[PDB]
């Protein structure tokens, strides 16, 4: 806890405002108060006279729609001196330094004599306040000129908290009274006195706009406008009673800001409505109670950490919107009521004001989710979570936050179509003051109702909405809007639910003899798409059926049809970013591949069923030693193969799937390595023999394996299964492991580091490989989108010639981090969100000082405990102590399977390791500079190929795409098994050998999969090379030069680039086509 407490303190002092700017602004607005005191009074005026008085003035009043017309504006207008007061965080001195900038709120209270009792009806109080602001602006402007401050002051209106009904004057300083360096914003709040209108008439259930439907938004606006100073007083008392209030306040505003949460209005569409004063007033409400028994949940003696923890726990578990609401008294212990108002509610009985009125239903669930997931991190003791909670901005990119994003282009956008304007109607103007508020609500209901369980959370954002407008104009002007609608377009953003996002049929109410109300809303909503169906279970239910596709999800069709039918038949709904990522995944050459969903693993299940057929065969077969078990350890068995398995598609690199065969422990195993492995081939040689006799439909052949260095007797049995799948079998025995340990012990001290590397690769294939499949295969299910993203992630590495150096397992461990460790984000639920999350992590991963350790466990045992956690951390420090720069090791990937952390990340050259981070960084920068769009994605998946010193192009004699099982094809294995090599790509093996010979001088790389990244016909592959700095320049000649060079002087040589090109050309034979140096 002490580590966190000190971490709190460092954050406060780092962000703490510099007190000098407080004096600077305090010098200014203190003088601004004097300017206000100069402003003269005014007489009673009708709308006709004030219009004439403001007719020729540069100032224009910000009348709120509907503007007062001569008939209904019979009430007069007058101005008098207000009571100037200072309000806001600056009043509480809980303010901070914000690089984007903060604001200072000053309230000018109208004298009560300017108000009648029934002025809260039909925007009566609204319009007189509007002219009151205008009269201030006129006189303030001229007085600003007289004092000569106008040179560096810019004045404009703005809407308070993006509330269209409360325009305010906003004062800034452009580059002695110049406060531009302070970066603070004086906002003049024109609010009403306390208790001018009976608050009981202003309750949410009541109405104040005659046309009856309630007006919660307007009732809050005037009532909240009349209740400012009281909440101000209410917060100081708490500030005195508990010493850690301001500290608790500043912790939340971080957490609000990093999640992109603000006090601004949410019905418009922007995510927000929970700001600092919502955050603080929840404290004060909780500090005097909050429980169902009205017991205190927070105590005044609590520290900043405890105060912050209580509200996060309070908000996470108690519901304030649907079932339950909280009541408190600002002026009486706060009590949690079980009844709910179906909207976020924090009633204040003293003021009769609901503080969560601006808080929307949809945003509230996302708030409740964010607090809960932080509470889990807050309770976490194994891992430090300070940086994630407070020092990580998730609000930068919408795609990373939100699984799917859809932009809806509304028709006739210099006003909305007559039909769409007609839908607004008069009743909804009363409910929702602006069409933006209503239209956003319209999208949410139809989108929420249409998708239902397919999604977790939905957000509707009015892109291009402005809140500030010049002094000369009465309302905000949008270029598309034309003073009609303050937005450019609507973006529909979702948090999908992977479990049922791809359901083919949307279940509905059951059939009944009388058509029920839920069935009524059912059949009407989907219309012709609605109908009645029966199932195997015998249930008769109204349901609608969709069609799966490999290019877009089912959610694409639902929103397009749902919005068009209800919102507007002319709406254009498009999400191309999903479609490009879906297409980049290879399309398998199976029946109905196009209609198959990306979440369907049908190809994978078919593979193991064929293995199960072979599984039964091997066991009943009689051998000298009984079979202990046969363990599949393949990529397709763990659902990570880049291209899905295809029958008879033997050109695929992953076609032959490795399997581990182990027999009963025996004391007769050879004690020598070569006899042991040759004895293994003898056992496999039997397995080939009577398999051929008993099961002739299975075909078989033998191949040699050289992955393990210096163990050249390894022979693997390749079985060509009749269903059309290939399997590679290698035998595992207990004596094999200890013999390697024997070699390390006997090896000379200089040779021991080499031998342990050989042991490292052995355990990576035989021992650790078995565990890797077991966890990932089980862990893959609930993480439905992990399989597509790791496949697409693997595709991205191959395009950039990085898979040749990165082992397959490392790409999986890096790709699973957003799933096992989603904080501060959520678990990926879409292909693009997961993939961009993987790229984001690699961009910001500092692998030299920060280790990667993963808890390969299911979502909330095998979780890493404190003892295991500190042990792995101890390991990373020890390795980095010997290898600070990270030349030998770059990526430290560890888990329960791999506590050492070097098992799957050893042998990667330092150059390549920097490419993964360097490419990831630029990709993130590209997304920032240019938003996610078709052009950007095409860049993300195309290789530059220019930085490489020399580039070699290759073409295979035949196209391999068809034989790889990729739909832009063999139906049986060749009669002669020699013919398999004729239809395969050797460039991966060509590069592997050439690196080792030129290990000291060159680094060659190539595309492992040629059918996917080799063009239309899948024959074009490229070998790209790099000359190390040392051999790039001339060197003195020595026996240990270990490089192909040319003499220049009697003791000087230089690299032989031309012959290496010839050496590659002869080694490539006819495949090589061109050389670019």
């Amino acid at each position: 806890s002490n580590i966190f407490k000190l971490q709190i303190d460092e954050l406060l002092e780092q962000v703490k405002l510099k007190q000098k700017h407080v004096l600077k602004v305090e010098k200014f607005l203190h003088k601004l108060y004097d300017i206000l005191q100069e402003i003269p009074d005014w007489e009673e005026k009708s709308l006709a006279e004030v219009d004439s008085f403001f007719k020729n003035k540069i100032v224009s009043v910000p009348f709120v729609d509907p503007k007062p017309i001569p008939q209904n504006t019979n009430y007069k207008f007058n101005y008098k001196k207000p009571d100037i007061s200072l309000i806001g965080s600056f009043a509480l001195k809980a303010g901070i330094y914000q690089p984007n900038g903060s604001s200072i709120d000053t309230l000018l209270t109208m004298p009560k004599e300017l108000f009648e009792k029934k002025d809260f009806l039909n925007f009566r109080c609204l319009h007189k306040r509007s002219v009151y602001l205008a009269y201030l602006t006129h006189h303030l402007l001229i007085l600003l000129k007289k004092d000569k401050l106008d040179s560096f002051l810019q004045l404009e209106y703005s809407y308070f908290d993006n509330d269209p009904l409360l325009p305010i004057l906003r004062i800034s300083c452009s580059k002695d009274y110049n406060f531009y360096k302070t970066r603070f914003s004086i906002n003049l709040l024109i609010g009403f006195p306390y208790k001018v209108f009976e608050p009981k008439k202003l309750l949410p259930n009541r109405n104040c706009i005659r046309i009856l439907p309630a007006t919660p938004l307007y009732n809050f606006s005037v009532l909240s406008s009349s209740t400012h100073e009281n909440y101000l007083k209410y917060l100081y008392k708490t500030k005195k009673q508990t010493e850690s209030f301001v500290e608790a306040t500043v912790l939340g505003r971080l957490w609000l800001q990093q999640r992109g949460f603000s006090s601004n209005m949410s019905h418009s569409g922007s995510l927000g409505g929970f700001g600092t004063f919502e955050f603080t007033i929840l404290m004060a409400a909780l500090l005097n109670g909050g429980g169902i028994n009205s017991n205190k949940i927070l105590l005044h003696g609590f520290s900043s950490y405890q105060l912050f923890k209580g509200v996060i726990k309070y908000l996470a578990t108690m519901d304030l919107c649907h079932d339950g609401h909280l009541q408190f008294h600002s002026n009486p212990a706060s009590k949690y009521i079980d009844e709910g108002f179906q909207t976020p509610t924090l009633f204040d009985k003293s003021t009769k004001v609901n503080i969560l009125t601006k808080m929307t239903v949809s945003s509230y669930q996302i708030l409740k989710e964010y607090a809960g997931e932080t509470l889990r991190m807050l309770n976490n003791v194994v891992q430090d979570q300070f940086s994630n909670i407070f020092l990580t901005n998730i609000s930068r990119f919408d795609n990373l936050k939100y699984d799917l994003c859809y932009d809806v282009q509304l028709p006739l956008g210099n006003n909305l179509e007559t039909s769409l304007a007609a839908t607004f109607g008069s009743m909804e103007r009363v409910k929702f003051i602006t069409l933006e508020n209503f239209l956003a609500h319209k999208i949410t209901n139809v989108a929420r109702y249409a998708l239902g369980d397919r999604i977790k959370y939905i957000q509707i954002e009015m892109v291009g909405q402005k809140s500030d407008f010049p002094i000369t104009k009465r309302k905000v002007y949008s270029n598309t809007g034309g003073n009609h609608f303050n937005f450019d377009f609507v973006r529909v953003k979702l948090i999908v639910n992977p479990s049922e996002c791809d359901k083919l049929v949307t279940k509905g109410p059951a059939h009944s003899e009388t058509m029920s109300t839920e069935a009524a809303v059912f059949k009407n909503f989907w219309g012709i798409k609605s109908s009645l169906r029966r199932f195997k279970d015998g249930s008769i239910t109204h349901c609608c059926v969709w069609s799966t596709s490999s290019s877009e999800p089912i959610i694409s069709s639902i929103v397009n049809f749902a919005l068009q039918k209800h919102v507007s038949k002319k709406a254009q709904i498009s999400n191309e970013t999903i479609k490009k990522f879906h297409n980049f995944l290879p399309l398998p050459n199976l029946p109905s591949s196009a209609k198959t969903s990306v979440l369907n693993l049908s190809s994978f299940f078919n593979l193991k069923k064929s293995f199960d057929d072979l599984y039964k065969i091997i066991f009943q077969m009689k051998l000298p030693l009984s079979v202990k078990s046969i363990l599949p350890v393949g990529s397709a068995f763990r659902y990570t193969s880049l291209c899905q398995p295809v029958p008879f598609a033997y050109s695929d690199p992953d076609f032959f799937q490795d399997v581990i065969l182990e027999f009963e422990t025996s004391p007769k195993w050879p004690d020598e390595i070569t006899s042991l492995e040759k004895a293994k081939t003898a056992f496999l040689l039997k397995i080939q023999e009577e398999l051929s006799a008993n099961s002739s439909t299975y075909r078989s052949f033998f191949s040699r394996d050289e992955s393990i260095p210096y163990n050249l007797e390894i022979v693997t049995l390749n079985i060509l299964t009749p269903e059309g799948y290939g399997f590679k079998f290698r035998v595992l025995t207990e004596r094999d492991e200890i013999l390697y340990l024997r070699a390390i012990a006997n090896a000379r001290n200089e040779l021991k580091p080499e031998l342990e590397a050989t042991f490292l690769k052995f355990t990576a294939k035989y021992l650790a490989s078995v565990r890797h499949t077991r966890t990932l295969e089980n862990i893959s299910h609930s993480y439905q989108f992990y399989s597509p993203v790791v496949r697409l992630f693997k595709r991205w590495l191959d395009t950039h010639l990085l898979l040749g150096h990165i082992t397959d397992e490392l790409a999986e461990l890096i790709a699973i981090k957003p799933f096992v460790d989603p904080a501060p984000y959520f678990i990926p639920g879409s292909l693009e969100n997961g993939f961009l999350k993987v790229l984001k992590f690699i961009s910001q991963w500092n692998w030299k000082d920060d280790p990667l350790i993963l808890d390969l466990v299911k979502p909330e045992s095998e979780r890493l405990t404190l003892a295991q956690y500190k042990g792995i951390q101890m390991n990373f420090t020890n390795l980095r102590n010997s290898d600070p720069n990270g030349t030998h090791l770059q990526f430290f990937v560890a888990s329960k399977n791999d506590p050492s952390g070097i098992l799957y990340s050893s042998g990667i050259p330092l150059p390549i390791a920097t490419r993964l981070t360097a490419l990831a960084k630029v990709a993130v920068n590209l997304l920032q500079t240019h938003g996610l769009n078709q052009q950007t994605i095409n860049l993300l998946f195309t290789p530059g190929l220019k930085d490489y010193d020399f580039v070699v192009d290759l073409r295979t004699p035949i196209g391999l795409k068809s034989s790889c099982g990729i739909l832009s094809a063999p139906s049986n294995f060749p009669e002669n098994l020699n013919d398999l090599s004729e239809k395969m790509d050797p460039t991966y093996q060509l590069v592997k050998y050439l690196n080792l010979k030129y290990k000291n001088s060159l680094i060659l790389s190539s595309r492992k999969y040629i059918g996917v990244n080799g063009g239309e016909k899948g024959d074009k592959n490229v070998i790209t090379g790099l000359i190390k700095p040392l051999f790039k320049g001339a060197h003195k000649f020595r026996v240990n030069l270990d490089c192909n060079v040319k003499p220049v002087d009697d003791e000087n040589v230089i690299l032989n680039k031309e012959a290496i090109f010839h050496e590659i050309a002869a080694f490539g034979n006819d495949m090589v086509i061109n050389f670019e140096t």
Partner: peptide, 14 residues
Amino acid sequence: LSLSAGFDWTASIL
């Protein structure tokens, strides 16, 4: 166009 990153052999990008 393409994403091209200057090759780094001193781990300086990190």
